[PDB]
Amino acid sequence: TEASQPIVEEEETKTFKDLGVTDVLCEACDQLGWTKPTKIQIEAIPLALQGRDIIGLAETGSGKTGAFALPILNALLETPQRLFALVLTPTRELAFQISEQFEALGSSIGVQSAVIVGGIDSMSQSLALAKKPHIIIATPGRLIDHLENTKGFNLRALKYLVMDEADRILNMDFETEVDKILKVIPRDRKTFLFSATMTKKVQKLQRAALKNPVKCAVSS
Ligand SMILES: Nc1ncnc2c1ncn2[C@@H]1O[C@H](COP(=O)(O)O)[C@@H](O)[C@H]1O
């Protein structure tokens, strides 16, 4: 069930290409100054590219965003589709930070993202959703506001779900909102869940939201 932790020689030598990342995305990494993959990237990317669900035990600073963004963008290039991936976050700040990385990696290949968070007028958000972005990065309550109230908005097309900082999502009282979202997305999708630790509450969510996941743990 557990991913192979990278050892010192592998940290020193692995490339993004070695992980299976397509050439145009290897170039985007270089352009960002991502010249070596992090350990969570080395663990999760090949498994995700093979189509495995992922549970990542990792925190900011580990490179967890690239560990899910790169496989999502790789698949998007293979099979372009709007409303392709949803990333859920506990906070609006993390949503903007994740969008910065998707835009940095994907803007030049034409990938469109939309951030859907509190503190922003709903009419700009409804327009952004009508424009059918490839990626939506949202906090759970604001996403449900749009699922309930924004005409024509739904997640039936989704191929990827990410729950980033899932321990914090649950600790911030979004259990019901997450459960509601899980009811109105497709079962046939790829899913990532990242958390700083495994707890009973996180294990309940992973058993509800992931299929045969590989556990990828790092300390840095
Ligand atoms: N392979 C990498 N090489 C250099 N920097 C990276 C790499 N992956 C992620 N980063 C940066 O690490 C920071 C923390 O990312 P994260 O741990 O996803 O919150 C962000 O500023 C990323 O741009």
Author numbering: 11 to 230
Task: Provide the authors' own sentences about this structure as they appear in the paper.
DExD/H-box RNA helicases, from virus and bacteria to eukaryotes, play important roles in processes including ribosome biogenesis, RNA processing and folding, ribonucleoprotein (RNP) remodeling, RNA nuclear export, the regulation of RNA translation and transcription, and nonsense-mediated RNA decay. DExD/H-box proteins often contain accessory regulatory domains and localization modules, but their cores consist of two RecA-like domains joined by a short flexible linker. The N-terminal domain is commonly referred to as conserved domain-1, or DEAD-domain, and the C-terminal domain as conserved domain-2, or helicase domain. Both domains contribute to the binding site for RNA substrates and both contribute to ATP hydrolysis. We used X-ray crystallography to determine the structures of the DEAD-domains of DDX2A, DDX2B, DDX5, DDX10, DDX18, DDX20, DDX47, DDX52, and DDX53, as well as the helicase domains of DDX25 and DDX41.
DDX47 is involved in pre-rRNA processing. It interacts with NOP132 which recruits pre-rRNA processing proteins to the region within the nucleolus were rRNA is transcribed. Its side chain stacks with the nucleotide base, stabilizing it in its position. Interestingly this residue is not conserved: While phenylalanine is most common, DDX10 has a tyrosine and DDX47 has a tryptophan in the corresponding position. In the crystal complexes with either ADP or AMP the loop closes up, resulting in a shift in Cα-atom positions by up to 3.5 Å between the ATP- and the AMP-states, or by up to 2.5 Å between the ADP- and the AMP-state. In two of our DEAD-domain crystal structures, anions from the crystallization buffers are bound to motif Ib (a sulfate in DDX5, and a phosphate in DDX47) highlighting the ability of this motif to bind polyanions.
